Homo-oligomer: A and B are copies of this chain.
Amino acid sequence: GMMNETLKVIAERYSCRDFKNEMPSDELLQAIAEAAIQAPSGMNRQAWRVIVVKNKELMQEMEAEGLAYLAGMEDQSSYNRIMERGGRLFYGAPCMIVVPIDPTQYGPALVDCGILCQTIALAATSLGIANIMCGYTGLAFASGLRAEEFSKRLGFPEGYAFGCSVLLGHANTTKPPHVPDKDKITYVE
């Protein structure tokens, strides 16, 4: 099929689950967050924010809270699959972009959210920065007991809830991207 650098970036983008501790430069983090805000959104409502998190302590706390919520359910199956895969929710990533969203914008805010997270992932991949979408960061808020705390520490706008996150760093170990399923494309001529 036809190829160009953007299409190569789309093709090569993969979910990294093993990061080195090396922090990406501010130069690169800025390019990535500038790319995110260029994401389109329904009615241009931009019912999101781009929070570039580099604080290790806050990251570890949200991770440990996330794991504990999972480890607290009656059905521990999910927490057990995670402990067998390495026991990390952020795979040693030294930073992440958290995308909170306005929940009173319902479904349209989630679509917009995904549009922006993909823009981040593609921008990071073009810059040689490994990444992964991580919905599990959301577990830090799930009990509701530490939700306001993490919200203020992250600087969420009032009323905003977690939407998604993208972890960023340099890959320690690689993975191929998912195989494209060509059977999901049809044509209505």
Contact = CB atoms under 8 A, between A and B. Distances in A.
Count identical subunits in the complex: 2
Query: Chain A interface mostly helix, strand, loop or mixed?
Result: helix
A127 B10 CA distance: 13
A73 B87 CA distance: 53
Interface stretch (A23-31, A64-72, A139-147): A23-31
Given A15-B40, A122-B6, A135-B108, A185 B34 contact: yes
Interface in A1-40: 1-7, 9-11, 13, 15, 27-31, 33-40
B10 A119 contact: yes
Interface of A: 1-7, 9-11, 13, 15, 27-31, 33-40, 42, 44, 46, 48-55, 58, 107-108, 110-119, 121-123, 125-127, 133, 135, 153-155, 163-164, 177-178, 180-182, 184-189
